[PDB]
Design an enzyme around this catalytic site. Structure first.
Site, PDB file in Angstrom:
ATOM      1  CG  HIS A   2      -0.925  -8.906  17.205  1.00  0.00           C
ATOM      2  ND1 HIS A   2      -0.531  -9.407  18.436  1.00  0.00           N
ATOM      3  CD2 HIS A   2       0.401  -9.219  16.275  1.00  0.00           C
ATOM      4  CE1 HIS A   2       0.594  -9.727  18.468  1.00  0.00           C
ATOM      5  NE2 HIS A   2       1.117  -9.704  17.044  1.00  0.00           N
ATOM      6  CE  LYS A  25      -4.414  -1.518   2.094  1.00  0.00           C
ATOM      7  NZ  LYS A  25      -4.267  -2.539   2.883  1.00  0.00           N
TER       8      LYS A  25
END
Lengths: 168, 168, 168
Positions: A97, A54
């Site tokens: 996470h 990205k």
């Protein structure tokens, strides 16, 4: 200057462990075997790779997820490239996470911060030479790491450090 | 230099599709009609706009969500401004969604990277002129894009490119 | 230049309010009492602190979560350091929450942007002096804020502003 930024979010539980064979490079596989939480590791590496592509802007042009590795120094992920993706010399990366994994990649081009060992005269003909250190000569170049590496190894020169990027 | 950063997280499912009429600009509406996953698109654009205003620091001073558009070149979102928000000339943006949408906006001011076509003498009186290209003259200015655009169009001059920002 | 980046994600609901006593600094506690949504505030501050230490790269070397405070100017979080963590003079931070909190920290070293009040001759012997303003002298230095503060207060000098970082 900032070359590009990338963010990726994924639910850890919905990432299959079987994806390890498709997305991980060889050095990541060795790191994967050490890991206690296997599903988290895979989810995190998938997210980091997605965030990286990205940040490039072109996505997967002719590249694979195995062409980009995220290893570890201390506890922080570190980018390792096996291909030329651009002339950025810094990849600032972060991963977190908690049920969902979130990865951040910021690509930066800094003036200099490329260390090369070799003949002073050889380098000054080709590059803007900035400083001398124990590691070698600091040069400014917009040449991608593998292009630079191939050019230097042809002579009696060696690429010591390319910003904070790991090569090969 | 980095002018500001913004992050936004939102649960896609809890974003109503009816918000499209309130938050989307005209060009975003045309892009919205093309989209298969409509709820995701709206959630993503809301998150990007929120992240953008967070990056500004002042929030919604006198601005609306329609004053900021996120279009697409290739597959990446691109910032389009319909108002002057600052003198940043680069907006590095990223969006990801997996049940939750996460948007990232990094605003940057780079030296130069503003391309203007016109009389050399006219420009040198007013601006620091850096380079000449096929697109036009590269100048350094801290003038916001619409302020600059209005100043140039008064004469026989034209704003070609303002960093990576789209104008109007 | 970018010194480091950090991202952190956490589920708000699974963050105990009792953590306030362990992670919050004194000024954050005063801000905490004002807050209507208490669990969100704690979750957000935990995420910001985690993101900050990720951006440093060394993690918690000899530091505590209370050594780093995130206060508020307008509606945006602002970094307040009670210790020397590096020579970055800008911390660009953002926080969002929707069931999950996501925090972003980008550390930057800008040339200059350190304002000091004192004798011109004293400063020019020690530092590269750039500009004079109403607030004081703008200098370039790689000295960490507390090291600089202690050096200046020994003489008849005062640290006015250190980038966008709050000190003490």
């Amino acid at each position: 200057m900032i070359v590009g930024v990338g963010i990726d979010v994924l639910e850890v539980e919905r990432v299959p462990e079987k994806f390890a064979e498709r997305i991980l490079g060889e050095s990541e596989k060795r790191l994967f075997l050490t890991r206690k939480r296997r599903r988290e590791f895979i989810a995190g590496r998938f997210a980091l790779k997605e965030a990286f592509f990205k940040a490039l802007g072109t996505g997967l042009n002719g590249h694979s997820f195995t062409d980009v590795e995220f290893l570890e120094s201390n506890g922080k992920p570190v980018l390792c490239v096996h291909k030329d993706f651009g002339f950025f010399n810094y990849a600032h990366v972060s991963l977190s996470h908690d049920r969902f994994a979130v990865a951040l990649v910021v690509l930066e081009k800094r003036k200099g911060d490329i260390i090369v060992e070799g003949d002073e005269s050889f380098l000054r003909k080709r590059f803007e030479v900035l400083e001398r250190s124990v590691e070698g000569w600091e040069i400014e170049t917009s040449l991608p790491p593998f292009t630079l590496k191939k050019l230097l190894e042809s002579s009696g020169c060696r690429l010591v450090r390319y910003g904070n990027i790991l090569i090969g």
